[PDB]
Design a protein around this ligand. Structure first.
Ligand SMILES: [Zn+2]
Ligand SMILES: [Zn+2]
Ligand SMILES: [Zn+2]
Ligand SMILES: [Zn+2]
Lengths: 479, 478
């Protein structure tokens, strides 16, 4: 018990309509025009606003230990700041060291995430292979609510998976009904260009984009895609930044292949000139992988969203303050990679996509929660306004205004990649598991309030794959 | 000296009536009603088309491979070529892993000495070290080699992985050499092979299932993007799939120098051949990449017509029945390869020219001139011009030939086009100014052919160099 949102237009991934919505006991209890108020149930007035599923950010790195160091944003600050921005759940990554047990890395991460203010889940990264990793994956799916496994195709000599691994792991994912996910950059090429730029003496952040140009993403997307086609698995590609990688996804989808693509707001709105800023720390602030790209790539990504070839939005929320960035003051390859975004994603997208008329409100919802839930088999528990669904919601004021700044954001990091940008259309209120956790300026997150969210295996795409595999079965010739 | 009189000269771009005089290995004169020098033999070409002799840039004469040695040797293979209108080859030095390239190279020169017509070599990069790199440089500077092949498949044999591709392509750029690639993802092939064998599918019908088209498309994608990133051209051998062809068109659509090669096999045969109820027949078709579903044939023809595929070849790599039978209980041990050197030109004329898919000019481009230009042999080869080498084919658009292993000159007991009848045939073939095939009479002689050196830095390198210069990485000062 008990929270009634009254007066709003409910906006789903597919329709708009006027209704009141009642939350109790973490769930949406009722939806209708003029609902009755249970006694002492709190009431939020939503006249002239839109009430939508709360955002799900399927790509966070809260307090990740990475590139000599540990991300500035912990599970609490991170998940809180997300709430302030209308995001109600995350999926983060367990990234074991190579040769490290997955169940061990997984219990370590569950540890770190217990302090979450909002619902959370994990993908598990496959950073090495053995019969043991195969075994443990099965357990994570059977016992621990994991149904998606990440592969890094870059970060050579660190966590990179090569073809022999990708093949073995993807086959395992097929066996388990789990979704393979990939960070698609060709690692040998990145490694090769990094050395060559450093050997020429190019050590600045401006050399970061040059060390990993768009065709390096395109290559790796092609390869992850064709391994998935060849093994009979779906595939989810994280943070697509390039035309080249988008074209591979469209090409595969165009042949009937289940491939999904995620995009970050930064890759929709920023270009690679940012790395040439006169101030080192500013430029360094933008360093993440894949990097920001020449302008023609933004337009292409927008169209991918408009055409159904890109499916989800996310942030790759991986915060490093200036002093951490400056670990690579003399060597761009040692700047810790990552930008902040959890709090800003929904407003950035609404303002650039809906106000401009590129995206309908419905696509906005699809791209901010529902597609993610459907892909990872959380629908209709999440990303849905219906009776029985988790009461994760955001109330949106289309005329409200906000100016993005590191000075004022709830993200624990001293840099914002959209510093000074002003957006129209903001989350006035955010509701997580039935509770009002952000209210016109007031953040009310509390450590440990979040739950761990299990995702069942075998999303329905695996039924279709199953029937195809059966129909395609090889038949010997008799002689 | 040899005068060809009364033919229509057909090049990669035009047709005209003229006689052609050859002497001393070379074309001496071209013009209407040329004078006959005394002693000169005269070939009457009235009603026929005189074209450059075909260049086949992909042969494997007497290759030791998959536990045996190809049945066709450098003499029998180049002689069979000449009967087919093909006057020069490019074959492959394939050193074993950890074997010196130079060692392998001289060995292959020995094997090739017996060739009946002009020949040259690509050299395969089957392992990597500083010594390989040094050897590549000596091959280019001293030995007339200007192209290096990389195999993306054949895991635990001659397969190159990304780290070798990158380092080799970079070495290729340094030397002005053309990287070439056999584009199949070896890890997927290897995985599928085991899986299929583990399920007891051991027959030839499983060869194609073990390397479906996307495995080729992936590897073309990857070679292409490595080449783009390192700033080299790229040549992809025997493209069989829409997927690979689409990767080439995509890259050429961004201004990237990528060339594709195609075999007649892959233009005209489909994967149903592998389900033949006779084991030996099905096995005769086993090569890599395998023949594909029909839709890929049409895509390939369209590649030719659009300028996204550039050369034709044969992957001439012959194994007789007893040799193919080494894989009788395991398709993955069937020696991979089919014959085609003799048949390439008539197959293509017949399927492409008679149908109106290709002009005669395109036919010339795709059978000699584009290969010449790509590997820096134009206009010495693939050109009918004074001072060019006198490698010529006289083509009777009315003749007919029926292809058969019982009648072909290829030293192998199987022909992947057994029984097919083509219209338009080479009536005569001239190599080094000499009449080596004359309407059924083959006059090839062991050892007549020459080793043909190809200079480095084809023209594309000047363009890449201007590009590289305009994209100098430039540091921001602070
Ligand atoms: Zn990533
Ligand atoms: Zn990430
Ligand atoms: Zn090959
Ligand atoms: Zn070959």
């Amino acid at each position: 018990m008990s929270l009634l949102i009254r007066g709003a237009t409910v906006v789903t991934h597919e329709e708009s309509y006027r209704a009141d919505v009642l939350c109790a006991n973490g769930l949406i209890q009722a939806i209708g025009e003029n609902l009755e108020t249970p006694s002492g149930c709190d009431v939020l007035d939503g006249g002239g606003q839109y009430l939508m599923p709360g955002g799900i950010d399927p790509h966070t790195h809260m307090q990740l230990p990475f590139m000599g160091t540990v991300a500035s944003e912990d599970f609490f600050s991170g998940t809180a700041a997300g709430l302030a921005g209308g995001t109600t759940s995350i999926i983060d990554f367990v990234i074991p060291n190579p040769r490290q047990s997955l169940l061990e890395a997984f219990h370590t991460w569950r540890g770190w995430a217990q302090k979450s203010a909002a619902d959370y889940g994990f993908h598990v990264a496959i950073t090495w292979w053995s019969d043991e990793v195969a075994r443990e994956m099965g357990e994570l799916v059977a016992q621990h609510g994991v149904n998606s496994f990440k592969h890094f195709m870059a970060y050579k000599n660190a966590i990179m998976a090569a073809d022999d691994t990708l093949v073995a792991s993807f086959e395992r994912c097929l066996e388990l009904g789990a979704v393979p996910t990939v960070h698609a950059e060709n690692g040998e090429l990145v490694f090769h260009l990094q050395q060559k730029l450093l050997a020429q003496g190019l050590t600045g952040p401006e050399a970061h984009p040059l060390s990993r140009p768009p065709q390096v993403e395109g290559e790796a997307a092609s390869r992850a895609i064709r391994i998935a086609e060849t093994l009979g698995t779906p595939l989810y590609l994280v943070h697509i930044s390039s035309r080249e990688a988008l074209d591979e996804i469209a090409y595969a989808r165009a042949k009937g292949q289940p491939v999904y693509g995620e995009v970050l707001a930064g890759h929709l709105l920023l270009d690679d000139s940012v790395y040439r800023h006169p101030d080192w720390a500013t430029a360094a602030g933008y360093v993440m992988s894949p990097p920001f790209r020449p302008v023609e790539h933004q337009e292409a990504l927008w169209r991918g969203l408009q055409s159904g070839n890109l499916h989800t939005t996310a942030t790759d929320h991986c915060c490093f303050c200036a002093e951490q960035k400056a670990m690579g003051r003399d060597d761009f390859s040692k700047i810790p990679n990552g930008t902040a975004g959890i709090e800003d994603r929904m407003a950035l997208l609404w303002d650039a996509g809906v106000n401009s008329g590129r995206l309908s409100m419905h696509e906005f919802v699809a791209l901010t929660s529902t597609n993610t839930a459907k892909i990872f088999n959380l629908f209709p528990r999440k990303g849905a306004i219906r009776v029985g669904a988790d009461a994760d919601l955001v109330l949106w004021d289309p005329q409200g205004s906000r100016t993005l700044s590191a000075a004022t954001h709830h993200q624990r990091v001293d840099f914002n990649i959209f510093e000074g940008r002003t957006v129209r259309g903001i989350p006035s209120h955010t509701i997580s598991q039935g509770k009002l956790l952000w209210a016109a300026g007031d953040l009310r997150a509390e450590p440990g309030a979040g739950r761990y969210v299990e995702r069942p295996a075998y999303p329905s795409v695996y039924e279709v794959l199953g029937r195809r595999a059966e129909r395609q079965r090889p038949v010997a010739v008799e002689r």
